[PDB]
């Protein structure tokens, strides 16, 4: 089997991408944030505290003839941005882009943190990291991909995120028309539960490539590119007037600037992030200070190849017995 679904930016900045997901019978379609940095499929629901729902579409398990309470199971998750959610668990039929999994754990939120409530466009998350990170207790549950894998034509999914435009998540096949050149594959460590890999270096604009190992994670659920402070300083030094602002929370730059590209290495291959992808717009409405899309990871503990990086590439998440990642230009 295969599946293919379009993923759509939630706003004009590509802050996140939503993909329609069918849950239950008859189908209830929710728009979920596919997140290769986490491993829970959780949704706003009829159980979510009413004051914490503000415009999201909810899953109502009592209206699904295939829903079953997973007795005794609870979940609770905290994300790297400080947001969180928790609740109970149903199993139900879940379909993405024509690919159907029966008995998928659907984690129904009883509580969500304010950042979720305040984002009416995201109805939940669909985790695509390794199932070892799933938070369901006392019986850990498998991700959608883990449940689907054995049925897929090939045990892979691909992320093809658009810049200010829709893109595609495919399951079970590699669309050879969706990228240019060849796909360069690179080793993955699953020891932290992430799609963790090592970039071979970077360049700023037309500058020389610096060969240096940068360990990080491929994370579709993170907006920006978070890299070591040395790398980030080297990038922003090429933008007149750019500076790190403690009050804003990162590097800002004059909105009048033209940003240089940023290149990262994948083995001997190179992925070029155009400068425009690094512009996240005014820090507040009407400001002439703009927020940068490359930020320091120093306070995180891990480097994160988020959407800024991934949307410059066609990315293969190869879930074979020994997982690997592939990157191609497009």
From Swiss-Prot:
* EC numbers: 3.4.23.22
Question: What reaction gets catalysed by this protein?
Answer: Hydrolysis of proteins with specificity similar to that of pepsin A, prefers hydrophobic residues at P1 and P1', but does not cleave 14-Ala-|-Leu-15 in the B chain of insulin or Z-Glu-Tyr. Clots milk
Name the Gene Ontology molecular function terms of this record: aspartic-type endopeptidase activity
| Disulphide-bonded residues | 255-290
Task: Show where the Peptidase A1 domain sits.
Answer: 17-328
* GO BP term, example: proteolysis
Q: What class of enzyme is it?
A: hydrolase
Q: Which UniProt keywords apply?
A: Aspartyl protease, Disulfide bond, Hydrolase, Protease, Signal, Zymogen
Q: Which domain of life is it from?
A: Eukaryota
Where does the chain cross the membrane? none
Query: What family does the Swiss-Prot or TrEMBL record give for this protein?
Result: Belongs to the peptidase A1 family.
Q: What is this protein called?
A: Endothiapepsin
Native organism is Cryphonectria parasitica (Chestnut blight fungus)
Taxonomic lineage of this organism?
Answer: Eukaryota, Fungi, Dikarya, Ascomycota, Pezizomycotina
Q: Which part of the complete sequence is present? A: 90 to 419 of 419
